[PDB]
């Protein structure tokens, strides 16, 4: 709807920052089993719902 509380405001924010490629610089290190940014949220698939 038009309006949507601060908490709510928080939930997207927190998520968005996670919804993108894992920090690559990390990836490079020694012994990095590291498949990918697993848990990334999306929208034309994955509405956050509610």
């Amino acid at each position: 709807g038009r309006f949507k509380p601060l908490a709510i405001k928080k939930k997207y924010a927190k998520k968005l920052k996670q919804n993108r490629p894992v920090p690559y610089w990390i990836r490079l290190r020694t012994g990095n089993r590291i498949k990918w940014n697993e848990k990334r949220r999306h929208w034309r698939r994955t509405k956050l719902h509610y």
């Binding site: 405001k9 997207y12 968005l16 920052k17």
Partner: protein, 121 residues
């Protein structure tokens, strides 16, 4: 001798005998933090194209500030912190998570100048 008189058929209590308690040595807190403060208030400036434009036109700085901040507080802080006065502040927090303060610095000051007092580019 002498009974009360009565204002309703039924009884009451009277509010009285209240006068100091002042429970607890209280106020606990040691060495008071005093909550928030300035190197923390203003987190890193915002500097987009829009900043670049805003700087010019209303004399305005866009800064990333502590999003909890109420406007006031910010106002107090900067003026003192930057030796200035600001004609006005529009703020918002984007879910970016940061409060952005659009501040017109007063004519007594120039946001670009002032920028490169900070040494802002």
């Amino acid at each position: 001798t002498k009974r009360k008189a009565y204002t309703r058929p039924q009884f009451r209590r009277p509010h009285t005998y209240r006068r100091p308690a002042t429970v607890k040595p209280s106020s606990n807190v040691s060495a008071i933090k005093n909550k928030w403060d300035a190197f923390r208030i203003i987190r890193y400036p915002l500097t987009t194209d829009k900043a670049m434009k805003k700087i010019e036109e209303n004399n305005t700085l866009t800064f990333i500030v502590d999003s909890r901040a109420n406007k006031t507080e910010i106002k107090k802080a900067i003026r003192k912190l930057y030796q200035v006065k600001t004609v006005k502040v529009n703020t918002l927090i984007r879910p970016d998570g940061l409060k952005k303060a659009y501040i017109r610095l007063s004519a007594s000051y120039d946001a670009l100048d002032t920028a490169n007092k900070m040494g802002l580019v």
